[model samples]
Target chain A: HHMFTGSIVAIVTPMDEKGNVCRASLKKLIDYHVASGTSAIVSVGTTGESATLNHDEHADVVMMTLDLADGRIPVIAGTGANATAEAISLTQRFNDSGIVGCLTVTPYYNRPSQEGLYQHFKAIAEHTDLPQILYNVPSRTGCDLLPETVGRLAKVKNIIGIXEATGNLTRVNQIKELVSDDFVLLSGDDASALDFMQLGGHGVISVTANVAARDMAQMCKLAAEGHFAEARVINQRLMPLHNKLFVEPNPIPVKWACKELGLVATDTLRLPMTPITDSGRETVRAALKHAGLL
Target chain B: HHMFTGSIVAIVTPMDEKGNVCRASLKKLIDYHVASGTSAIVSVGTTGESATLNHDEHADVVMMTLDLADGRIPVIAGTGANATAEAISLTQRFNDSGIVGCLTVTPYYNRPSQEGLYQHFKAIAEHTDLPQILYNVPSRTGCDLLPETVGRLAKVKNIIGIXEATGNLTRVNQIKELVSDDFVLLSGDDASALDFMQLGGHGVISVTANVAARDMAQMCKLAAEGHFAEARVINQRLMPLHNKLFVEPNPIPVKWACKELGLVATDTLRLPMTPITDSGRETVRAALKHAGLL
Candidate 1:
């Protein structure tokens, strides 16, 4: 069930200086994405600063993103999850006609074994009707949702595909050969999303798409039609944006780049996630300039 | 303050078959620890299944533990933390009261930079009077609490010692000279706790103690008195328990071991943490037999 394809931006949830979610900035980002031809919005994913958001805040932000987008674009929420009960209820909450899907990143902190990983996702899927996408970012989660487990999860009817973030191109075929031809494989890393796509990935659930939405969209559009030469041009321009946005951790530099480009009211993030440093700000600024977003 | 010393059990929070915290089992574990002469108790830690406990449940377990002990032993909480607001409230709620200390595992999943780690802990410390202890288990947390950062946090009056799970013995003295002689340096790894203590670590925040409480406590007591010969005998007897409890991600085997010893009513753990498989059960059973605790 390749429900989502193309430049699906794993969008940032803008917060004001006091760390409150900024409604005006939220709408502005949605409005810009709609205009930029970005495919879908995955709200409250890692780039959304989901860690510090309390349960109510986490649910509210996803709801707000959908309401702001107003069906102009599809919305698949990152459940702020890994908590089974919380993930389940959030999945049920957003199982409304409006929301498209939910992303279930593997359970974090308490690293479970392969069988446990399978059971965790399987349990969530059995309880909800929402088409869940598996997210495997072991670097952050410390629990790798391996291809073998992905293959196990793939046979489940509602598990549409995976957002494989290891940035290992080999995983594309490794996962592809295991699942059905219809299963979607979206790259979670912006740096290699184009290369990932060229190697038969459907598209990217991208961080770069947050700021350089049009370029990312155009690049994906070109790659979808076997237009590599042109896609590479756009990919190359935005390559600097991809590298620098991660110059600090996810959304740290990306959020700053959003503010630099006036995509948000402020670059404020909550505790444990501070503002981008002076050196990182300068780095992101240079990348934005290189990408012509400045 | 280096308020906690000796073999502090990183105790398991026993749950029923359906995942409810079994208060009877909890009381049993606490009573066992009190009689066995274990130094202190850390409730809802990683070993305590803190990850699956929601905020209310997490707080309830910690408080339940304190009330159960009732002055027999000190209760230090493992905040179910990493979130700033939640961490602050739990720390303050138990502060000015019987809860002796709180173990703040450096924010997991979201791998923050060194300065970010420093600032995250500092911010939580500022909001409460609880003597916060730092936990660095990078294998699970994905963020290492480096020695340099430890030195910086050591300077913070209320932020007491660390539970270094890196399992490298060299860290004991590296951290020792960086802090006051009284600062606690506890090993988070059970297998190395004896060697770690001999290398100047005050004690261990141990998983092995959850099942073999008396032996672990006695081992620490022997080590404390500079009696290496006898301590090694106890450590050797209990070494298999130390190694096997972690045959699966912690509390998996240890929880089963507890049930085997009849300490808790069942070996049940919450979702994403499954029951020990037969293979793992055999390993743990053998370890228990070897330790004479079967």
Candidate 2:
């Protein structure tokens, strides 16, 4: 594959105070990534709040990112939905957008079995010739796409990678051992991204990158290039930032951090997701300052 | 107001293999309830697989059950979402439908902070005139609507009760002592429903009722009526069914049992949710026959 394997930034969706996507702000953010030397851009992923966005908005964010990047970097779209039909629809749209790859999250809330997960991805693979990345974050989705399930999906022609977010590093090792090396296993959890790479992850689809994109990209680049000691040092510096971004439910803390960095205008989120508490905001600010971002 | 304070059924949503609601079988199950004297009916709740349902199906199921019961029961709709806006919208719909109450589950996946949850339900209460019954099942939802939060919520106008499914009876006692006597506390978990009642819960939203509706209703009735000895004896008879129904996730095993009983035409569920395993099916079958139904 291309040299896009390293710290992939989960780009934030820029919204005005009223929570509408700010196209101008988004374009500016894309330029920020290019100038900051961020490795790759993951658009409309959970950090971008794909769950709340309508289908049109979901596609718009991914397409806009792809248009802005213009092959300068890989654009991975978060195209997963609880319904197989919805996921397929989204994936097809992403593939049509000429995005580099699609990150399909395991069905959330519905609690699908491993067999069901296999079938869901298989259906998607059969329908599309595009590269697909499976995302497993059981914390958000009650069901886990087990390593065995991943192994089964690995056999599919277009299933190129998986974002392992379960945070069980041992499982990551087991998964790496079981799946084909050709299949990219990316870390979905920022806190464990370093160890995940150490255990053979190609890179991380990171939440922390929304705030510390340069530092994160450098660390993962160092790890990918076998600059192990330097990478470890960078990872150590980014650890506090990683911990803070997730201090509240993901995207929440990252959204706040974006505002702190003056990257986004509002620290607001959609329904069910509130702004970080005052204490949470303080913790995030302290972490960003610690990481030298502020 | 019945004696059995704690455990209640979060009844299953029975559908044909094509996922169509089985109205005839649903009626028969309700008949089973009448004959057995079930305590309350939590129709179209999560165990009823409310998440997979389209909006029409959700409202139709609740409305149909209300018609079937003809006021012979207390029907609580599972009206909760990670989106406060969605939850409010659904709760308003349920309240207008003439149901006994709306069972608002703790926002799943998004995991609002305790304060977020408080404001979530509080918003619904302030906006709608529905008698609110809060549901807390942390196993499915990453966040727990803690007892302190529950105590605070209890003070809201029209915030009538809660369905405590945490399976922590001590917490039930703690919660009971904290809330006013006017506030009802129902048990959302069948496994610990009896203990919860014994600890001064008002009722339960049961899963076991899908298979052993009569016996479970009897158990809850006896418990609520302070017929502790009779309730305990009946509870023993229904214990096997309760244990089996939850062998897999809620609704899967229960739906299987409903199909086996010829109550629902199909055991098929929507995407992400699959049928019970052979072993799970067998376990539920044995429990059903033991309860004298199969």
Highest TM-score: which candidate? 1
State the local distance difference test value for candidate 1: 0.86
RMSD (CA, angstroms), candidate 2: 2.4
Q: Per-residue lDDT tens digits of candidate 2, residues A1-294?
A: 543477788888888877778777777777778877777788888888775677788888888888888787778788887778668777888656777778888877667678778888988877787888899888877778888888888988989888888999877778877777778878988998988888788899888887787888889888888888899888887888889888887788988888778787777777667778899989988888888888
DockQ of each: 0.69, 0.49
What would the per-residue lDDT of candidate 1 be over residues A1-294, giving only the tens digit for each residue? 444889998899898889999999999999999999998999888888778887678889988888888889989988736557767776777766477888889888888888888888888888778788899888888888889889999999788889989988899999999999888999988999989999999989999999999999999999989999999999888888888888777778988888988899999887677778899988989989899878
Worst 10 residues of 2 chain B by lDDT: B1-10
Docking class of 1: medium
Q: What's each prediction's TM-score?
A: 0.97, 0.93
- CA displacement after TM-score superposition, residue A54 of candidate 2 (Å): 3.8
DockQ, model 2, C-alpha based: 0.49
TM-score of chain B of each: 0.97, 0.91
